[PDB]
Symmetry: C2
Subunit: 197 residues, 2 copies
Amino acid sequence: SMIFNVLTIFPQMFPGPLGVSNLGSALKKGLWTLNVFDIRAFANNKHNTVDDTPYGGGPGMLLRADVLGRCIDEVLSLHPNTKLMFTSPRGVSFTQDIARQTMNFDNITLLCGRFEGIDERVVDFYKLQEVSIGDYVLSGGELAAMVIIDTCVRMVPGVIEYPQYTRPASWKGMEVPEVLLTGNHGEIEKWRRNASL
Amino acid sequence: SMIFNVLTIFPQMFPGPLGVSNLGSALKKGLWTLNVFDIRAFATVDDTPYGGGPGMLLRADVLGRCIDEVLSLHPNTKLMFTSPRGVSFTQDIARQTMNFDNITLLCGRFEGIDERVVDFYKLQEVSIGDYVLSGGELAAMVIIDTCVRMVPGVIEYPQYTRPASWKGMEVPEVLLTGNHGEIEKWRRNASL
């Protein structure tokens, strides 16, 4: 069973899109496992704070190393060989091929940043692998984690170019390419290859 | 208010991540608007493809009824469809998308959609990255979060906060000096 551990201050977002259709049923059959750790539960402080203002000035807030360290050490005690990742803009560009390389690991941990990010000592101490799902700024790392997990889980055994058409044969005066209705396997294959280029 | 219309066979997924924190509170106070159209209400929505092939395909007639309804309500909406063949979504493309006050995101499922829908409506195809997802919903969320963040009112160096020492690792001392000039220099130099 491929195991994903997601570290978030918004545990209630999950499984969200991951609980639907093939992902969701594979999750119920135990072909993959989703552990969603609530970062706020490891705060262990007055007011229960996960974040604070950055040293040196600057706006916004930053996830604290001590809080994140407690969450991550708990994950590591449970999964000593997990691959620790972190959703961020300066990461490696996530691609189908990066997803396949990730598949070499049976245990992945996705730390989701919020606010202005995380204390950098966390990145360096744990040697987090930074991953970016694209060149755009999101509100936090959760959607990025969901993107990565969907991509990867689709490749777990047992889980799962040319234009396509289905009924009706005519819709708003627009007709399906006729070759598709001939049952002519050779012409259909030829048509599909040429429509693909 | 900036309007997003999402067309999906999984309306129950929304708002989801878009209903949390700043996005969620901006939504509740009306800085932006999320209309989630259930494609299934305008029908079976999917059928086997002409010519053979695995899987199913969302039907043109069903999608057309849903899209035509969206168009009667928002005649000037920018029609978009999330798909692997699309333009690469980037911060720049998000800024260009902002030039429209009204955006519609059709989310594909199964093996995709009937191609006449793409051509009749001239859907702008958008891809959030070079990877295959289970459907267009997460791509719609990424696009919406990205865009909504730039609506007024809604909202590279290493950073550090307390404690000053953690597992024997100290915060760079310059950040604790209150020395604005040296902090600026240090942040400039660490951004390379």
